[PDB]
Design a protein around this ligand. Structure first.
Ligand SMILES: CN1CCN(Cc2ccc(NCc3ccc(F)cc3F)cc2)CC1
Ligand SMILES: CN1CCN(Cc2ccc(NCc3ccc(F)cc3F)cc2)CC1
Ligand SMILES: CN1CCN(Cc2ccc(NCc3ccc(F)cc3F)cc2)CC1
Lengths: 278, 250, 57, 236, 236, 278, 57, 278, 59, 57
């Protein structure tokens, strides 16, 4: 057991000749809700062709297997406002438009997650900038629902004993981690046509099922004589994906981060007349 | 001939002498919950026959200016026979459905309807960033009207037909299970919808399993006849329904 | 305990080794080598099979 | 040997598993000894009973009163003894119990629960009680007729002084959030007089009951989080 | 163990496949359940029919009119019913269809296409139509005599209310660009009156036709790109 | 021998029907100190259910297998006070609250330790900051009990010949090391209800058994023209853990780092009355 | 001298290799794959076994 | 299957002696378009020689297997002109002369590509330069044809959800990636003697077939108090190469990046007379 | 796993041979076709005749 | 699953191991060990073979 060993082309085209019979493949009835299965070989003479094309790149695994930004935020190393020196982001996947659209083509999903963090820093403009500061360090902390939440940069809550955390230093490769399928159902749900209270009242929509927790970031101990601003970008990359119940892609522009609200939009563009082809 | 269909559930029967085949959800027939997939501990109740039967909801009137209608399930059957009582008295429920939509007209009428069941048909408010009560989207068995023009009342859902109140192209609804009622060659559409959800069971008062939509793509037309409208009727029948978690009536 | 397997390549005209280092299956790399598919679920959801040659009704 | 560093190098993840050098090579550890009472899973703790402070009346001058449910003779017919929400990780009643403490270190939970009631009255006293569990709904029960519809057990007081109500796991989802909300409600538990308490001459006119909470053998938790009950402002 | 880092170390490539540590060791995932309707390839979606808004007349007060092609009685002989370019990913007609949306996530495409037409007139109405596909050329057809030279099918309206025109894959290259240009043109599709529509007394004088678009079983796409239809200016 | 090869679901639910017999599983007697073992199948009719849930995440190994801050301190590269240019921390695990609580749920523990150090630097504010300084280097030294202790940054004791030490440079990954079970007993003890002297006098409590040594940190040779402040955080991560004699979790807030002293606290919160459920 | 073993994964619907590089057992990675447990120590510490069906006393 | 196992010298010279016969290897006829195949052994006496020379270094794989710059561009971290803070380069291989020439010796090519990016930064000159800025980070994004194009540094399009991207930090090794044969034909074409429209009108030349997409680069969040300029160089390195239909190397200097236009050039240099050999 | 970086790490050598990640996973390449005239070594070109401009008379 | 093969070296007067880590064949290293060649395509494209010794015409 030092080793252990472990492709699907599209359909070919078969030669067809002249025909004259009672069979009518072309004629059908869409009223049944059944899409036809005719092929070009059934309506005109065709030669024999061997197709080596493959549909590898259209698998859901590959379609969703690309990292995408889902959130970015800024925090300063030193400032008067306490709330401005750290970030607190409730986790959700509906704030950036492209990744949201991509996900919203399926009603239910089940996958592992790969998270990557990109952090950059810059010196704020000012009258006096001459200073020398060693390399900075950052802390990322994940707080499952119901856990304590810090209220300031130097709060006791930053002494994580059970909450996973990452300490990262500038100049190295971006931080990364993997998370398993952390849901309470048998699959994640992009849509939820229901209410919170059993009396059909309360919050309505997917917001109701969003209880993934929070993420907090801060400078470990950096406190410069002059302000320094940092930005963090979060990237998600699904793995081992399964999807169910496809739905039509969205057409109207997004307008709210926790709702389906929209404005009516034309079906498509227009042209001069039904015959114009130029 | 394959143009004749007969369906017998419980103590009710449906016979259509001119119809197309029956569509079956995503190729899955309704069935009971398996032992290795359940989560609740106590014994379920399975009142077949008493609940698995056809229930004809009320009827609508199809005019030359109609735009469409929708119903939401299972809330539509909230007060229909023993099904409603069982749903009231239980915390959890589970059941598939058989939807049959009838519409008949002479050989000289023309028109086309789209019948489609949309699971998790979440809808947006008429005015962005404004909440609405649970009355502009489901109030029992009564049907709701789509609107040709853009909606404006904040108390109601956006009824713009071409967007289907979901922010998606109306022409793309074909992806869901569906059928067409074409007056040339059809009189009814039959759809068998299995139980689709992210959990084995769910409360039927808090969650709308799926939405039924009827949209006239080709408006009704006729000339020189005494009939002014074409009635439309909808019939539903739960299949393999089982409840759990008995408690006080809601 | 190493796995050997083929890698995408052309057609008319080739093995890589993989080893898992972590004790959680969520850490494995993406398994993007599966190509099985079946569209009959969405294209032919009817109850009675229909032959293309025969009339629909 | 050519190599390429992938993203994530040089990161410090607090929940990683990697080998690292030993700072005390060839250190001789003390021989092991089998101390009694080894514990290998927090669930073992979670299945032990603990007293539930049900009597949170906002007027408890004496703290110990929280653990005793009053009962009287000549009680109106069909009266409510107590009622509470079934939120083991959030409700004040179960918040600090031996079970509640364990859950607060996690985010998801599932399984059944056991509620045990013990009658600590006199030996000559007698009575019957109805204990019912009502699954989630629009309104909690208000009268015994409403309560008796749901899961319940009729408790008879005799030589055996304890009765167990097993709360079944009825839920639409495989798991429930510890920080429960409207979506993942769990229901209510209430107790009512079935017959009333009768006593002979020369006995106290009042008695008390105690409740114990524990998890069944199918209980489990998931996702570790940091508890919110303990906090500090300055280094000790 | 001597080693040398090759170029590319410490880079973050958004489409890489590497193992990384798990932040929640020994996490117990919820058991899987076979929900109906699993999808394993976007082509499965791409092969489903969808209505094509062919009637883009720049004067559509009512949006739903875009899906209905007018037809009249007593029509001049051999008249054109409609015409369009075959650019499934670029032309406004196919831009937003269920098929067009999928292609817009890719750069290359190949394979045949299906166009299905359904007559939604009266039961007593009758007629014949000629539907032709013209490969790329210097000029699109202007009269039925020109159209009938290329691939075409004569459609007869009867009990079967639907007819399918299969557009064959004729191209000099194995693939075509979604952002089509002069080099990779695909041709035109047009429909003409073959005999005309005849109706008996007491029937409407006008009818409508609808078109459905879908991909054959040899269709495929390649190279993933980000779609251009959706955009934002500020964080939501 | 090139290779060598090497799961436990919760109990299921069995179907149960109507019953009428002399057996009374519900009735018991807690006076015995024995917790019941009834199941829902013993009091109401139930269906057959197969449970695939597992208790993997609740093992003591996983419960304690998370790194947590246990101490943080600051030291300056250059300053007038000698004692302010280096750190001297007696090792103990009772200074940060969360990790302390977590550990205090068991009376005795036995585990290996994984230690990680996070170090960050920042330039102190001042009137003149224009300077150029190469990357800094730090030294961490561990002094078992009874060894010599440095008295200043440039003391001879920093020439470790037997004391393990780590030299670290900013910009790289955090330092790390592993330590074996270094106790004098067969297990560590979080509590000790006893005295030091055999006459029942002297120190009382766990302090008595705390003899793990000290940790010292300093800048190797950095001495800037202007002050630079650095902070160090220490993280502990038990491995191969075994625990004995569980005890109830603490309820009252901690107040001393080497004592169990506390202030009385209410058992729990209150509500309107015994019947209020809203 | 490599060890191969299974990794956590789902249920209804998978091997990693490990090698030790250091000469001290304390350097090994956490052995978080053990799931054996027994609660009878704390739940049934009585001397005489009691059958649930039978009366307690 | 733990392992699996898996050279061509030039022709030798054969000894030849005096000859006198009717065979005339020297005489031939180039009119046939057939190059001779005579050898020195056929015209003068030769000794036996064993040649160990090999033609390994002249294979097309090795000839083209060298990375070469194909494009360089500059962008500033902060400036008034929005278009000057990022780069947008349509991909093509005809802008740098040497690599262009090398490729243009074959009509058709088919290969995989290895791309490497070299990024450097420098502070722009100015009156005040005293500032402190942490390490910078850069983003490279690839946009296949037809995708959305950003219009400013902070556009929404930079939240790639399907477009591959690389985030890189200064001080590390250069970024790298590999791309497969991404063409729509069975081979890439350096030349195309044809038009775009079927009426023999429109664009003419290889430009017509250039539809590989675009590349965009920007500073992630760096925004300095004073301008900082960065430069990026792109290197391509073909792999697994196949070539067809060789053509003579170019002689006239290049003058346009998307055309074959040139100016007439002398065939070669001159000398005093036909007999001069000094 | 202890390791030590040797000199030359993090260098970019224009004539190196190393594996690198693919930016388009599971991409389906177009099928190959045998175009006439494949060339596999520049010497094949070098052995073809060509006219030599011998008459370089500066006039 | 490792490949062993010879490496260029001198003449008169030697094995390296390779393993593939990625699932796409495009990630492999350059296969610059092929030395087969045939110039007759460009040097002798005539229809009738001509013997060098014999006269061309
Ligand atoms: C409303 N649903 C929300 C979840 N969304 C899928 C999803 C689920 C979880 C996550 N991330 C979970 C997570 C994992 C690890 C962390 F550190 C923080 C986190 F929030 C991302 C996307 C589908 C739509
Ligand atoms: C009172 N007991 C003190 C020990 N504590 C467990 C414990 C023991 C040793 C350690 N660390 C030992 C150590 C190991 C390596 C060092 F470099 C320095 C050290 F102090 C940490 C926690 C349990 C409570
Ligand atoms: C006109 N032809 C253009 C293509 N050229 C060969 C070629 C093809 C593609 C590429 N690069 C493709 C590519 C690959 C990956 C990217 F991120 C961006 C890209 F543009 C480079 C050279 C031959 C001449």
């Amino acid at each position: 057991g030092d080793v252990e060993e472990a492709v699907v082309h599209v359909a070919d085209t078969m030669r067809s000749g002249p025909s004259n019979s009672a069979s009518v493949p072309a004629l059908t009835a869409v009223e049944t809700g059944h899409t036809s299965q005719v092929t070009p070989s059934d309506t005109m003479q065709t030669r024999h062709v061997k197709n080596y094309h493959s549909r590898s790149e259209s698998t859901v695994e590959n379609f969703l297997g690309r990292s995408a930004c889902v959130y970015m935020e800024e925090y300063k190393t030193t400032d008067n406002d306490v709330n401005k020196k750290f970030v607190a982001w409730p986790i959700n996947t509906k704030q950036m438009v492209q990744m949201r659209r991509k996900l919203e083509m399926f009603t239910y999903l089940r996958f592992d997650m790969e998270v990557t963090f990109v952090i950059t820093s810059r010196q704020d403009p000012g009258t006096t900038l001459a200073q020398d500061m060693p390399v900075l360090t950052h802390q990322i902390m994940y707080v499952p629902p119901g856990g304590p939440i810090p209220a300031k940069v130097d709060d006791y809550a930053w002494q994580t004993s059970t909450n996973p955390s990452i300490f990262w230093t500038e100049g190295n490769a971006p931080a990364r981690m993997s998370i398993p399928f952390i849901s309470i159902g048998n699959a994640y749900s992009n849509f939820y046509d229901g209410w919170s209270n059993f009396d059909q009242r309360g919050s309505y929509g997917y917001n109701t099922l969003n209880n993934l927790g929070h993420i907090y970031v801060r400078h470990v101990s950096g406190s410069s004589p002059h302000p320094i601003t940092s930005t963090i970008r979060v990237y998600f990359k699904p793995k081992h994906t399964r999807a169910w119940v496809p739905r039509p892609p969205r057409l109207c522009q997004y307008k709210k981060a926790f709702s389906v609200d929209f404005t009516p939009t034309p079906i498509t563009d227009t042209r001069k007349d039904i015959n114009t082809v130029t | 001939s394959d143009r004749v269909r007969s369906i017998t559930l419980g103590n009710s029967t449906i016979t259509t002498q001119e119809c197309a085949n029956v569509v079956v959800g995503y190729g899955r027939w309704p069935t009971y919950l398996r032992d290795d997939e359940a989560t609740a501990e106590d014994q379920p109740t399975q009142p077949d026959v008493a609940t698995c039967r056809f229930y004809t909801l009320d009827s609508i009137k199809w005019e030359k200016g109609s735009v469409g209608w929708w119903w939401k399930f299972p809330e539509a059957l909230s007060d229909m026979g023993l099904f409603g009582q069982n749903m009231q008295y239980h915390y959890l429920g589970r059941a598939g459905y058989t939807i049959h939509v009838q519409c008949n007209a002479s050989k000289f009428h023309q028109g086309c309807l789209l019948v489609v069941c949309v699971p998790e048909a979440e809808m947006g408010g008429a005015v962005v960033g404004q909440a609405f009560s649970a009355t502009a989207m489901a109030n029992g068995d009564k049907a709701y009207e789509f609107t040709s023009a853009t909606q404006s009342d904040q108390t109601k859902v956006q009824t713009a037909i071409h967007n289907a109140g979901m922010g998606v192209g109306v022409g793309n609804l074909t992806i869901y299970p569906h059928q067409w009622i074409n007056l040339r060659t059809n009189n009814s559409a039959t759809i068998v919808m299995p139980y689709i959800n992210s959990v084995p069971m769910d409360n039927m008062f808090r969650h709308y399993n799926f939405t039924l939509m009827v949209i006239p793509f080709v408006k009704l037309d006729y000339a020189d006849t005494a009939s002014t409208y074409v009635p439309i009727t909808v019939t539903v029948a739960p299949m393999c329904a089982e409840y759990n978690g008995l408690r006080l009536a809601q | 305990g190493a796995q050997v397997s083929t890698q995408k390549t052309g057609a008319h005209e080739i093995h890589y080794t993989n080893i898992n280092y972590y004790k959680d299956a969520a850490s494995n790399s993406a398994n993007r080598q599966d190509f099985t598919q079946d569209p009959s679920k969405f294209t032919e959801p009817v109850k009675d099979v229909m032959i293309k040659s025969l009339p629909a009704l | 040997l050519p190599t390429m560093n992938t993203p994530g190098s040089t990161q410090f993840l607090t929940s990683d598993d990697f080998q690292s050098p030993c700072a005390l090579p060839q250190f001789d550890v003390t021989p092991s000894m089998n101390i009694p009472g080894e514990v290998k899973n927090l669930m073992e703790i979670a299945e032990v009973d603990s007293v539930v402070p049900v009597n949170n009346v906002q007027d408890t001058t004496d703290q110990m009163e929280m653990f005793r449910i009053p009962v009287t003779i000549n009680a109106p017919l069909q009266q409510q003894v107590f009622g509470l929400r079934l939120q083991p990780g959030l409700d004040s009643v179960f918040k600090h119990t031996l079970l509640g403490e364990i859950l607060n270190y996690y985010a998801h939970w599932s399984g059944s629960m056991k509620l045990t009631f013990v009658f600590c009255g006199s030996a000559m006293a007698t009575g019957k009680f109805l204990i019912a569990y009502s699954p989630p709904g629009a309104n909690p029960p208000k009268t015994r007729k409403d309560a008796m519809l749901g899961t319940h057990i009729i408790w008879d007081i005799g030589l055996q002084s304890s009765c167990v109500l097993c709360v079944p796991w009825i839920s639409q989802t495989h798991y429930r959030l510890v920080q429960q909300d409207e979506y993942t409600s769990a229901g209510y538990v209430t107790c009512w007089y079935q017959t009333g308490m009768i006593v002979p001459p020369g006995t106290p006119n009042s008695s008390s009951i105690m409740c114990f909470a524990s998890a069944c053998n199918d209980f489990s938790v998931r996702m570790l989080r940091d508890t919110p009950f303990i906090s500090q402002d300055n280094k000790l």
